[PDB]
Design a binder for this molecule. Structure first.
Ligand SMILES: COC1=C(OC)C(=O)C(C/C=C(/C)CC/C=C(/C)CC/C=C(/C)CC/C=C(\C)CC/C=C(\C)CC/C=C(\C)CC/C=C(/C)CC/C=C(/C)CC/C=C(/C)CCC=C(C)C)=C(C)C1=O
Ligand SMILES: NC(=O)C1=CN([C@@H]2O[C@H](COP(=O)(O)OP(=O)(O)OC[C@H]3O[C@@H](n4cnc5c(N)ncnc54)[C@H](OP(=O)(O)O)[C@@H]3O)[C@@H](O)[C@H]2O)C=CC1
Ligand SMILES: [Zn+2]
Lengths: 460, 208, 342, 125, 115, 86, 96
């Protein structure tokens, strides 16, 4: 969502909506509006290392960078891995990719899981919301699979409600019968139903066939479960059946994926491996936690005497388990590029500078590279964005959302794997409003969201 | 409409319109526009090449006799290709009248000095050069007048920051006054005062 | 790092440097330069003073609003020292006198006071201590000044093991007693020199270099428990140095040899002044003593300071001693002096 | 007579700006967004040119907000985007330009509040 | 013809000749400035400062900009010769008090956020 | 020697990428069948030029232009990149 | 309602007090810290609640034109008094 940060004397005062007719219209989410105070609560301000007693203690930038560089120079290849968090910018992602490549490492992963079978991340349209948000107001039917769009993407749900109200849009859901603020046809929560729709046995399959502009949306939260590849294959089968029966209506792009992580799409565009399984297969000796506060990897899943480096802006579940802490900037403290769930690249602006000794993330990575001897070829923001263009050109087009349709190739490549589905009902992580308020480090540090959760749990 | 509204004077308006037409007729080569404001002020917009002729006419013609130069100054409008606007205010004691002559220039195009027509211009032009960087050709002595010695830049330009670029302090190591990059204990607090609602419908611009 | 002490700004007057420095002897020759350099970067400077507050006026324009705090202190009172060093993370000791008063002798200003400062700073949680000694300080010198310097240096080291000790040699500057001292003896007709000053070697150092070295040692993590020697790039014979001094000042140079006992007697005669003595016996001893060479010690070049030669800075001190005839003479007109370099 | 200069306009050496504040500065050219708290649109007509935000810190005395860059409050107003771009180029500043965002024309119908069969019928007034 | 009129020079050659005249005048003036203002710098130091100030604008290709630069330099010289400037103004050209700002990436990263 | 990933940056509607487009829509799938573990990132170029990137061990990478190529030309250069032949 | 910080520093009505490790306390050495002794919150808490026999009351702070702009307070809630948004005076209807 396009926003306005209003500051005064170098302090964030409030967040307001900024009108974008194609993304958020005139509205923002409550998490967007009221979670900014979490940027003042549990902040990493100075570098930290472990002392002789095994406790985190403050340190100059020079010594922490030298320690990390010395540990990086020892190991190489598969022994060095990095996990990116949910609020990581494209510049930091590409800097970390380059830094780990100079060591000949490819274990660059994200906590959010996307299936790699078939095309995987090879084709962009495989993991994008191809119809786009504004295109929702053109569809005549939409099928939702294994998601709660109300809490995962509140403005997307608002757009769906708007089309339901004005365009008489027909909505169906496969999953838990959550309250979406509009009436929908609930088909159930068993994933097998998807296969039934593809088969044509199900009543709803005919409904998709008659529709001129059908849309199928698969939430990335359903892809987090064990049979995510099978679910994606079934959804692609449904979309391909629609395209084969009704023919090509044009540039309609039936198939969609709804993301919930701000950093996921940029990481996939840059070539990061989705999921963590690559690290669990080959545990590393040095681990970079670029704002990774999801708790997917702990010290039980790693070899003992593992050198964990955390780089972020908040003290959360990922910081106390690290050996070196490098304080980074938040999204209000840097000019950073984030890519939309529909693929639209946008850039933030600096409202205030990072507190204390905190620095920009790509600058941290570049300084570490220079200390370690493998200096990266970029010194300024323009040069690192030139590198971003070199890796993925769409990351420098800052309002473009057009892209290619490679659904045929992805569908063909998804048929070579025949993984079995699970007989486990689809349950989204967010089931009621109470689960909506705290999702990431900033909103968990926010005292306003604690009040919201308390008020929802006991109304009083 | 009587008590709180400033009264009108149509006689002066008619006289000023007639004289503006007169001046435009006599000098078609340089006069580009003539205006009379609602409070009876006559304005003449001319090409930059007509500074010396027009002013000379306005000083020496029997019907003009604008013997006094009240004020000469510049206005900075960055959105215009010709950034700077040169304004001459003249007073006629014989006919008890005031006139305004406006021309334009940019950062690199010199303006002809009007010292020969009016002696009073000598300092004003200097001030313009000091505050906006407009060069005046054939000035007897053109140099900085208001700023400090060795001052870099022209403060009255819109892109010049309010507090400037350098500040002064006494240093005891060198035993003298030194200039350093400006640093403020309290930054100037910019205020957004403009209302999001239109105030004067009469001045509304076409919406393109 | 105590967030309130995290550096902020561009290193200017209104910036925050993260340094809270108590500068003892800030109303002296070196103290003004040290306080000026500290206040340039925007440091909180605490000035303990025992003189009249008027004599501190020149130190007030050197810092931003609230960045220079003047407090009274007594050298013999440890409570005063604790009061002035309680909130500081750096303590610099520039206390010293070139003569003995009826209240303080050489072992009072160079042994007792430095030891008390070091001990109170160590027990008050001060992190960094800078102590100034002399290059020629040793316990077997004929000068009681230098013997007290050496004793106080070792006592400060004992009380504050991780202290930084800096040993300059013959600091020259506008308010010095090195160039001004030799320029002022023109009023006695001739220049008395022991053995005509042909057996003495001096290596004077610029005042700005010493202040910069102190500031750099403050912000150098590796300089915790080291000992530095601050010397100039050139070594001169005393005769050549004084001749160059008189040449820059454009005064007639009429040196003559004076025996050691006679010069010591004139120093004792001048010692009787209840005010600042023109010269003393200890001053005579230190002037005619060769500068020690300690190559094993770190120097200014190890703190990033390139020592400024006397030739580029003698005019700024000695132009005041010229007459009206020679007042406008330039710098490169005086034919730099002969150097005993290695 | 005219001399026919065929070079790019560059007044950088004449403005007296320190070279630090010419090469490392990034300006933004944009039409400001409407304040979402009011419906007035009079502040979204002209183009603005502003500079990148620099560091602000707290004064050790009184806790005021101190700055070190002179262009913190410099905002310029232009009638068209091309004028702002020309000004930035001739002043030697590197710029980023955001296209104007105009609200789409809406289709409003009062009678739609009382539809016989559509979903737009309201439940209260 | 781009409809642009000159100040003094019509091409780069005349502008270069005016630059050379101004440079000669400054080079001749430097020793008198050192003597009159009682500066603690050498004549070579002042002449190198003049050379640096002239070379700071070596990239200009517009004769009008070169003309305006020469005019400003003439005013500066006229200020210096007539002793309108003071020792402080003359010594501002050297920045003796300003601490040198490091230019490499690591030092900028250590001190703060400015590029 | 050791290839790690390859990138095809093709511009969506410019004529110079037309042949490249044909490749992606005719014989990319077969290629992905042959190299099921090699990242082959298909990305959308601006109005400038189509090109192919090849990254090797320790971060070394090189690019080749694909302007006005044909499907045969692009598969030829891709197979040259894949094998130890330039 | 001044209280003493653990370090011994007086706490202002805004609640500000330098910590033990804060060097900025050195400005109060040989001098004093200025703390206003009359706490407005405690002073306004001492005022008795005014009983009125109307649903809506008016407050101008006293003194007529020397007070604050006149405002009207609703007193329909029985579990909470009506507070003036300028003066802090409390009003309520007869209950019990
Ligand atoms: C910078 O510091 C210093 C001072 O401070 C300003 C001094 O006064 C000082 C001592 C010099 C004084 C100013 C005394 C100078 C005056 C004369 C030398 C007094 C002696 C002259 C005679 C008595 C003349 C009488 C004639 C005879 C024939 C009898 C020195 C060395 C010094 O270094
Ligand atoms: N100048 C030189 O040639 C070099 C200096 N030395 C050492 O460098 C240090 C500083 O040098 P410099 O500035 O020239 O010396 P100064 O004589 O110029 O100043 C000495 C400072 O110490 C203070 N001070 C002196 N005695 C006492 C006392 N009994 N109690 C409290 N404060 C006192 C003075 O305060 P007040 O004004 O009130 O008297 C004064 O502020 C000294 O320790 C000196 O020994 C090192 C090598 C030579
Ligand atoms: Zn009231």
């Amino acid at each position: 969502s396009n926003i306005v940060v209003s500051t005064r004397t170098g302090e964030v005062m409030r967040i307001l909506p900024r009108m974008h007719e194609d993304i958020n219209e005139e509205w923002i989410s409550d998490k967007t509006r009221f979670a900014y105070d979490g940027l003042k609560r549990q902040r990493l301000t100075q570098p930290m290392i472990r002392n002789e007693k095994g406790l985190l203690t403050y340190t100059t930038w020079e010594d922490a960078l030298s320690r990390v560089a010395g540990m990086l120079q020892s190991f190489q290849g598969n022994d060095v891995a990095a996990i990116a968090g949910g609020l990581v910018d494209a510049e930091a992602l590409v800097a970390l990719k380059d830094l780990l490549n100079r060591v000949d490492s490819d274990s660059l992963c994200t906590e959010e899981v996307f299936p790699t079978a078939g095309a995987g991340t090879d084709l962009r349209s495989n993991y994008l919301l191809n119809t786009t948000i504004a295109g929702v107001e053109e569809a005549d039917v939409i099928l939702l699979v294994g998601t709660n769009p109300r809490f995962e993407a509140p403005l997307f749900n608002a757009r769906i409600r708007k089309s339901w109200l004005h365009n008489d849009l027909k909505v169906a859901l496969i999953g838990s019968p959550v309250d979406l603020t509009y009436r929908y046809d609930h088909l159930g929560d068993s994933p097998k139903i998807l296969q039934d729709i593809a088969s044509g046995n199900h009543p709803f399959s005919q409904i998709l066939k008659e529709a001129k502009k059908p849309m199928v949306v698969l939430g990335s939260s359903a892809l987090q479960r064990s049979d995510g590849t099978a679910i994606l294959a079934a959804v692609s089968n449904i979309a391909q059946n629609i395209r084969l029966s009704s023919g090509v209506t044009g540039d309609w792009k039936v198939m969609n994926i709804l993301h919930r992580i701000a950093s996921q799409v940029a990481a996939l565009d840059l070539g990061y491996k989705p999921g963590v399984e690559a690290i669990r297969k080959n545990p590393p000796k040095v681990l970079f936690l670029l704002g990774a506060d999801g708790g997917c990897i702990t010290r039980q899943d790693l070899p003992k005497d593992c050198f964990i480096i955390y780089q972020g802006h908040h003290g959360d579940v990922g910081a106390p388990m690290a050996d070196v802490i490098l304080p980074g900037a938040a999204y209000t403290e840097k000019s950073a590029t984030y890519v939309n769930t529909e693929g639209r690249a946008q850039q933030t602006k600096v409202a205030v500078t990072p507190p204390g000794l905190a620095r920009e993330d790509w600058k941290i990575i570049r300084a570490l590279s220079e200390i370690a001897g493998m200096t990266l070829p970029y010194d300024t923001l323009d040069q690192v964005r030139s590198r971003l263009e070199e890796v993925s050109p769409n990351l420098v087009r800052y309002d473009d959302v057009e892209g290619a349709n490679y659904f045929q190739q992805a569908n063909e490549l998804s048929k070579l794997v025949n993984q079995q589905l699970l007989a486990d009902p689809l349950v989204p992580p967010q089931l009621t409003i109470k689960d909506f308020y705290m999702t990431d480090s900033i909103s968990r540090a926010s005292q306003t969201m604690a009040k919201c959760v308390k008020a929802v749990t006991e109304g009083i | 409409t009587r008590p709180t509204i400033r009264p009108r004077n149509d006689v002066v308006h008619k006289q000023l319109s007639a004289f503006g037409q007169y001046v435009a007729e006599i000098l078609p080569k340089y006069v580009q526009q003539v205006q009379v404001s609602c409070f009876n002020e006559l304005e003449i917009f001319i090409h930059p090449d007509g500074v010396i002729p027009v002013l000379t006419f306005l000083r020496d013609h029997t019907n003009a006799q604008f013997k006094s130069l009240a004020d000469l100054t510049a206005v900075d409008v960055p959105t215009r290709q010709n950034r700077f606007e040169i304004v001459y205010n003249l007073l006629s004691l014989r006919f008890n009248s005031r006139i305004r002559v406006k021309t334009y220039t940019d950062e690199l195009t010199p303006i002809e000095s009007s010292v020969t027509v009016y002696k009073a211009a000598n300092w004003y032009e200097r001030e313009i050069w000091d505050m906006f960087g407009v060069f005046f050709a054939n000035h007897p002595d053109l140099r900085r007048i208001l700023t400090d010695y060795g001052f870099e830049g022209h403060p009255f330009r819109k892109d010049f920051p309010l507090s400037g670029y350098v500040e002064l302090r006494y240093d005891d190591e060198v035993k003298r006054v030194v200039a350093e990059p400006v640093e403020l204990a309290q930054e100037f607090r910019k205020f957004d005062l403009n209302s999001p609602w239109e105030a004067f419908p009469a001045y509304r611009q076409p919406p393109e | 790092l105590h967030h309130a002490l995290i550096p902020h700004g561009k290193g200017g007057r209104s910036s925050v440097s993260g340094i809270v420095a108590t500068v003892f002897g800030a109303t002296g020759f070196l103290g003004r330069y040290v306080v000026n350099h500290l206040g340039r970067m925007g440091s909180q400077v605490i000035v303990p003073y025992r003189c009249e507050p008027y004599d501190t006026m020149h130190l007030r324009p050197m810092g931003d609003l609230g960045q220079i705090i003047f407090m009274e202190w007594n050298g013999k009172d440890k409570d005063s020292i604790r009061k002035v060093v309680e909130h500081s993370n750096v303590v610099i000791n520039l206390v010293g006198r070139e003569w003995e008063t009826k209240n303080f002798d050489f072992e009072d200003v160079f042994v007792k006071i430095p030891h008390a400062i070091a001990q109170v700073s160590k027990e008050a949680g001060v992190e960094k201590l800078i102590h100034i000694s002399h290059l020629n300080a040793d316990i077997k010198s004929p000068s009681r000044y230098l013997r007290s310097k050496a004793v106080g240096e070792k006592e400060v080291r004992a009380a504050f093991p991780e202290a930084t000790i800096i040993k300059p040699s013959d600091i020259f500057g506008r308010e010095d007693r090195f160039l001004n001292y030799f320029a002022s003896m023109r009023w006695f007709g001739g220049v008395p020199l022991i053995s005509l000053g042909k057996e003495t070697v001096k290596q004077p150092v610029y005042i700005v270099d010493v202040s910069k070295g102190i500031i750099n040692a403050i912000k150098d993590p590796d300089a915790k428990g080291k000992t530095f020697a601050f010397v100039g790039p050139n070594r001169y014979l005393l005769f050549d140095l004084v001749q160059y001094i008189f040449a820059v000042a454009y005064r007639p140079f009429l040196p003559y040899p004076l025996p050691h006992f006679a010069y010591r007697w004139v120093g004792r005669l001048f010692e009787v002044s209840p005010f600042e003595p023109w010269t003393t016996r200890d001053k005579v001893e230190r002037v005619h003593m060769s500068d020690m060479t300690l190559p094993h010690l770190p120097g200014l070049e190890d703190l990033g300071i390139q020592a400024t030669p006397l030739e580029l800075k003698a005019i700024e001190v000695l132009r005041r001693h010229r007459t009206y005839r020679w007042l406008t003479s330039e710098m490169e007109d005086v034919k730099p002096a002969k150097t005993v370099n290695i | 007579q005219l001399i026919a200069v065929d070079e790019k306009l560059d007044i950088t050496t004449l403005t007296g700006v320190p070279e630090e504040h010419i090469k490392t500065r990034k300006v933004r050219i944009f039409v400001p967004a409407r304040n979402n708290m009011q419906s007035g649109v009079n502040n979204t007509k002209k183009w603005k040119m502003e500079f990148d935000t620099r560091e602000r810190w707290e004064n050790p005395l009184m806790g005021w907000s101190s700055t070190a860059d002179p262009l913190s409050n410099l905002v310029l107003t232009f009638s068209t985007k091309e004028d702002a771009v020309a000004f930035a180029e001739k002043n030697g500043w590197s710029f980023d330009v955001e296209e104007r965002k105009v609200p789409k024309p809406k289709s409003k119908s009062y009678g739609a509040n009382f539809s016989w069969n559509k979903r737009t019928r309201v439940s209260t007034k | 013809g781009t409809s642009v009129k000159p100040i003094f020079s019509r091409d780069m050659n005349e502008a270069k000749r005016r630059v050379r005249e101004l440079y000669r005048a400054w080079y001749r003036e430097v020793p008198n400035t050192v003597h009159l203002f009682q500066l603690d710098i050498s004549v070579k130091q002042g002449r190198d400062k003049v050379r640096e100030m002239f070379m700071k604008n070596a990239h200009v290709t517009d004769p009008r900009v070169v003309d305006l630069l020469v005019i400003k330099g003439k005013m500066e010289l006229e200020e210096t010769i007539n002793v309108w400037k003071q020792r402080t103004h003359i010594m501002r050209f050297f920045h003796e008090t300003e601490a040198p700002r490091p230019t490499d990436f690591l030092s900028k990263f250590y001190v703060g956020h400015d590029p | 020697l050791g290839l790690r990933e390859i990138r095809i940056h093709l511009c969506q509607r410019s004529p110079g990428s037309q042949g490249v487009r044909d490749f992606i829509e005719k014989r990319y799938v077969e290629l992905k069948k042959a190299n099921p573990d090699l990242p082959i990132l298909i990305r959308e170029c601006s109005d400038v030029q189509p090109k192919l990137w090849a990254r090797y061990a320790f971060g070394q990478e090189k690019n080749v232009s694909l302007n006005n190529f044909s499907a045969d030309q692009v598969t030829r250069t891709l197979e040259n990149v894949l094998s130890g032949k330039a | 309602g001044v209280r003493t910080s653990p370090t011994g520093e007086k706490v202002t009505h805004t609640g500000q007090a330098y910590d033990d490790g804060d060097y900025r306390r050195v400005r109060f050495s040989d001098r004093q810290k200025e703390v206003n002794e009359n706490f407005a919150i405690d002073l306004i808490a001492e005022q008795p609640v005014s009983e009125v026999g109307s649903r809506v009351i008016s407050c101008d702070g006293g003194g007529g034109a020397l007070g604050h702009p006149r405002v009207y307070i609703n007193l329909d809630k029985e579990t909470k008094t009506g507070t003036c948004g300028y003066c802090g005076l409390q009003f309520r209807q007869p209950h019990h």
